[PDB]
Swiss-Prot record:
Documented effect of changing residue 66 to H: Enhanced proton transfer
Protein name: Carbonic anhydrase 2
Impact upon substituting residue 61 to H: Reduced proton transfer
Gene: CA2
Span of domain Alpha-carbonic anhydrase: 2-258
Length: 259
């Protein structure tokens, strides 16, 4: 929260001046070295229960767009995997590039994907999101890579509403959206302890990154790139390259759910 962003003058290399935890011990994203991630047979299958999810609204917040969910009841929850307890879906958003060769935050053996989807969940034992982010096990973020190829039919409703939220601070009703249509076939994953990838960079996230990317079309991601970072009536700055690069792994282990 302030004047941070993704420009030359306010981008990721500057964030540490207002948010010193930027240089902390469990920062995200990271590069996932697939040959050093260890298979952990003690990890449980992931439980994604989105049947009763209630989307409400879509918001251009000046950094990305968020699809927000009603999190006032146990609808839409993530459980299992590396997690203890129940985590409730609050929002999802994406990070993406100016070109198809960059845009993801996590990388896989240094490969950058065109974009990355983050489904954000908070641990119900802390009562609400604001309290959860103050805890080392407060959030679980499910990360899904996007590659450019075939269209993702379940993404199109999101793509088509973006015209109505071009600029920072615009929102639109966005009810009855089913986030199951954004998942890949397999729920095989890597997991590690990390942080929010934007300020305030709080070290409160269990990351769960799916191995299988989803495919989206070139036309779908091109529409992401028509969004604006700026507000209405301000100089147009295309919302592109809203990703933080990989951060040092430090004293962490990345675990794989699969052999
Ligand atoms: N990219 S990411 O790691 O999935 C991510 C997720 C949620 C946030 N939420 S937030 O920092 O914008 C935020 C923090 C506290 C409160 Br209260 C509300 C929003 C930031 C980054
Ligand atoms: Zn994110």
């Amino acid at each position: 929260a302030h004047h941070w962003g993704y420009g030359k003058h306010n981008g990721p290399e500057h964030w540490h001046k207002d948010f010193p935890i930027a240089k902390g011990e469990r920062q995200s994203p990271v590069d996932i070295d697939t040959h050093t991630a260890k298979y952990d047979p003690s990890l449980k299958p992931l439980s994604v229960s989105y049947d009763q999810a209630t989307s409400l609204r879509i918001l251009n917040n000046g950094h990305a767009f968020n699809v927000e969910f009603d999190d006032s009841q146990d609808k839409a929850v993530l459980k299992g995997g590396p997690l203890d307890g129940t985590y409730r879906l609050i929002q999802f958003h994406f990070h993406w590039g100016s070109l198809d060769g960059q845009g993801s935050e996590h990388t896989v053996d240094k490969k950058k994907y065109a974009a990355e989807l983050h489904l954000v969940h908070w641990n119900t034992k802390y009562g609400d999101f604001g309290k959860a982010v103050q805890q080392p096990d407060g959030l679980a973020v499910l990360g899904i890579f996007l590659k450019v190829g075939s269209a993702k039919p379940g993404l199109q409703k999101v793509v088509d509403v973006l015209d109505s939220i071009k600029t920072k601070g615009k929102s639109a009703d966005f009810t009855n959206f089913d986030p199951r249509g954004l998942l890949p076939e397999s729920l095989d994953y890597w997991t590690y302890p990390g942080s929010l990838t934007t300020p305030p960079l709080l070290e409160c996230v269990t990351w769960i990154v799916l191995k299988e990317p989803i495919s989206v079309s070139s036309e779908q991601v091109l529409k992401f790139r028509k969004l604006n970072f700026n507000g209405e009536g301000e100089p147009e700055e295309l919302m592109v390259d809203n990703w933080r690069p990989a951060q040092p792994l430090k004293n962490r282990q990345i675990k794989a759910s699969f052999k």
